[PDB]
Symmetry: C3
Subunit: 230 residues, 3 copies
């Protein structure tokens, strides 16, 4: 409780926990093989984020990084979280439009570079270098977003209407929510330090819960995840 | 030799080494594509554990963690070992009953959460928190065990008798041997400290060798791993 | 610029960057599903190595390891690089000859053991033990090389001539370039220290660029990556 951001970490933990249990129970009994894949992927995302939010709450996922003449608290657990949950979110989208194996590999690899370089930037001690890593990480994200539009949107329009409809919604949700992440990093404690840590934690918590639980609520209520059968 | 547990680490190293060479030689010449998959998965498990046991023997896979007012030796290499070998063991079982891709993902993800949270619990410095992680890790294991019974056992009974027979044996071996791990952790040096480190090392060594080499001897002598062909 | 090897790190960074952009642009528009897989795998290899070379250039991927009575600079970022790029290189070869899933798993697992044990050897503080890890790592490599000859070369000769032709070239390139890595390690700063660090950096840079960009130029100009169609 000595950390003013603790309230936002406690709430994020609870929402990810509650999201995980809901998806887990809703997924009971689903026999359709296709739907089970989406339930498996989408329930795993908040389970992972739950454990990492708890580690931040309890103080484990925190470290001090000297830069700018001060010791700055850096929650490295966020990057462990994103390293495993962001490729799962992209897999949900790719399996929806039945993307080829080469495009999937491109997306997951670019995603691993995005999060990995963001982690290096967060732990870098030379101030100016942190923004070099931020730029490479942001470059990788632009590739992802380009694929989701001028690489995926065309394949969805040649499939069942419920798939094209649900993909377009989740695509739009993804592009909006993902693009906010590099901004909060840059003006927050990891970058320019304009926004205090307790408010940055609040902002990441809203985005994290929307992009994981909110994403899952939309997808798992759709007919797109079920095969077309009689 | 200054560590009394060294004898159990030297023996575990030798048994994993010897297990690896046996499986490797036995796997020579096997042309059946199905059998080669099981040989590949099952020989990799003791190769990985061999390298990590050796690192513990040589003192690399060891660190000191202050908690309870003392410096406690923690063999972190065990979790690196289990992180890579336990999903391979589950893959052996899943491919046997030809489980769907969504169930496989659920098992491997839950398994990664189980080992990952066990690692955090082992390195946690606040005593009471170590058991919070132990509980989350144990919760993930119960999900795995539930899948192996009320998720897999039903699919094996609808397949070739030799597959149903071999799966049931390996399932039973797995549930018994895996369930002992959380107990040794709790009463051992990582938890309550009731059992001394040298005896905990002995107990993990017996379980490790049984669940990896013993598991492999049963599976790789079975007809289930071979396709049904003339 | 206080590190004499910086020139070789700056050049390696540039060549991996330039290699990545070339493959990325050349891969634009390729619609053939098979070719897209190879373009995806092969463009990812220099993208990863670019980021790790940059981390070495900027001083992040460097640490000091006491052994032999001195503090020795160890670029641990090389192993992070190789951990992710070497299995991708092997996947390029395996998909070319359409290898079975069990052989692929064997190659990637043996490759992960090779790099992982090389990392432990590099960070080991007991001098004699560094060569124990070097030997296990080299043993795993011999298994890989054996598979590429007496495991793959036979499957390529039963396929389209352009595949057999391109595989044989890339196989030969791989065996020659990979086998040099354990030698430079042994006589370089990580081992016997006969060759100074600045020259070891030069040697790894030539090998790294040849085995990644050079490899990719040969493969991606071949007809083998395209399906046979009218
Ligand atoms: C879905 C229904 C619920 C929607 C909810 C969306 C909330 C997302 C945004 C929150 C920003 C909050 C900003 C709070 C800033 C407080 C910091 C502060 O005190 O700033 C003044 C400072 O002391 C001197 O400049
Ligand atoms: C497969 C054929 C072989 C089967 C073999 C199975 C062995 C597994 C169990 C071993 C427990 C050994 C327990 C040894 C405990 C010694 C600790 C000790 O000395 O305890 C007394 C203490 O000094 C004051 O209370
Ligand atoms: C593809 C076209 C280009 C091909 C290019 C291939 C280069 C690869 C090998 C370089 C070795 C360079 C060795 C340089 C050694 C200098 C170290 C030195 O000064 O050694 C003397 C020392 O001072 C007292 O013994
Ligand atoms: C000076 C230049 C330095 C280097 C530039 C910064 C590198 C990091 C940024 C982005 C990753 C780029 C994407 C990497 C993955 C590309 C995969 C690919 O080529 O995919 C083609 C496939 O056909 C699709 O379906
Ligand atoms: C198909 C699979 C594709 C997979 C693609 C993966 C790409 C990873 C690339 C770059 C990020 C590397 C980040 C490494 C950061 C290590 C930080 C660390 O552990 O630092 C230790 C200590 O704090 C200081 O030395
Ligand atoms: C498509 C998604 C793209 C996402 C990526 C967009 C990146 C650029 C955005 C904002 C940078 C704005 C400038 C921030 C730097 C301000 C530095 C400074 O000095 O700020 C002082 C402050 O304004 C008072 O104290
Ligand atoms: C307050 C509550 C906090 C949260 C609870 C503790 C979370 C960690 C424990 C267990 C992981 C649960 C399992 C995660 C993976 C589930 C995958 C799934 O839903 O699989 C359905 C599929 O149909 C199958 O074949
Ligand atoms: C389909 C793929 C599914 C993959 C599912 C993976 C789930 C991983 C989740 C939680 C464990 C995270 C554990 C992270 C522990 C890091 C410990 C560490 O490195 O600590 C450094 C230092 O000792 C102190 O700061
Ligand atoms: C299905 C598989 C389930 C596996 C998981 C089962 C977990 C519960 C088991 C044992 C806990 C027993 C209590 C341990 C705590 C004892 C604390 C204590 O004070 O012990 C003093 C000691 O007995 C003298 O010194
Ligand atoms: C004392 C002996 C100690 C132990 C020896 C050193 C272990 C590490 C070295 C090499 C890894 C060996 C290869 C591991 C993977 C083998 C996979 C396999 O068996 O593959 C068969 C499949 O049929 C193929 O297609
Ligand atoms: C199909 C998938 C197959 C995957 C096969 C993977 C095999 C990995 C095995 C051994 C390498 C382990 C190396 C671990 C090195 C850890 C070093 C480290 O982080 O050390 C921290 C600190 O510097 C000191 O305690
Ligand atoms: C197929 C690929 C195989 C690749 C693996 C091949 C490994 C063996 C090669 C070289 C070792 C040569 C001996 C190196 C040890 C020399 C130690 C020493 O004392 O060197 C002094 C120096 O020569 C003056 O100062
Ligand atoms: C789990 C929820 C989501 C939407 C996570 C996404 C995270 C990112 C898109 C992170 C992006 C970063 C960039 C692009 C630049 C470096 C800083 C970040 C790692 C935050
Ligand atoms: C390699 C052999 C086996 C059977 C390894 C299995 C390891 C586990 C089942 C570990 C379980 C843990 C739990 C459930 C709770 C935290 C402590 C552990 C990581 C030991
Ligand atoms: C990215 C380019 C290539 C060819 C990388 C390959 C790296 C290896 C083959 C590393 C081999 C090692 C061995 C075999 C022994 C321990 C030291 C190394 C990790 C360098």
């Amino acid at each position: 409780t000595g950390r003013p951001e603790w309230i936002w970490l406690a709430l994020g933990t609870a929402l990810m926990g509650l999201g995980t249990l809901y998806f887990l129970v809703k997924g009971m009994g689903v026999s359709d093989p296709d739907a089970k894949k989406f339930y498996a992927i989408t329930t795993l995302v908040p389970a992972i984020a739950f454990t990492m939010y708890l580690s931040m709450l309890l103080g484990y996922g925190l470290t001090m990084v000297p830069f700018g003449g001060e010791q700055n608290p850096i929650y490295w657990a966020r990057y462990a979280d994103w390293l495993f949950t962001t490729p799962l979110l992209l897999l949900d989208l790719a399996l929806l439009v039945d993307a080829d194996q080469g495009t999937i590999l491109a997306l997951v690899g670019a995603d691993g570079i995005m999060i990995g370089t963001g982690l290096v930037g967060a732990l870098t001690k030379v101030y100016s270098y942190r923004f070099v890593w931020w730029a490479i990480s942001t470059a990788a994200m632009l590739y992802i977003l380009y694929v989701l539009f001028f690489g995926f949107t065309s394949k969805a329009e040649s499939m069942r209407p419920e798939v094209a409809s649900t993909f377009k919604v989740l695509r739009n949700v993804t592009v909006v929510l993902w693009s906010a992440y590099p901004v909060v990093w840059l003006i927050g404690s990891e970058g320019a330090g304009i926004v205090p840590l307790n408010i940055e934690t609040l902002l990441f918590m809203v985005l994290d819960v929307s992009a994981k639980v909110g994403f899952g609520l939309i997808l798992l209520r759709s007919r797109a995840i079920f095969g077309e059968a009689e």
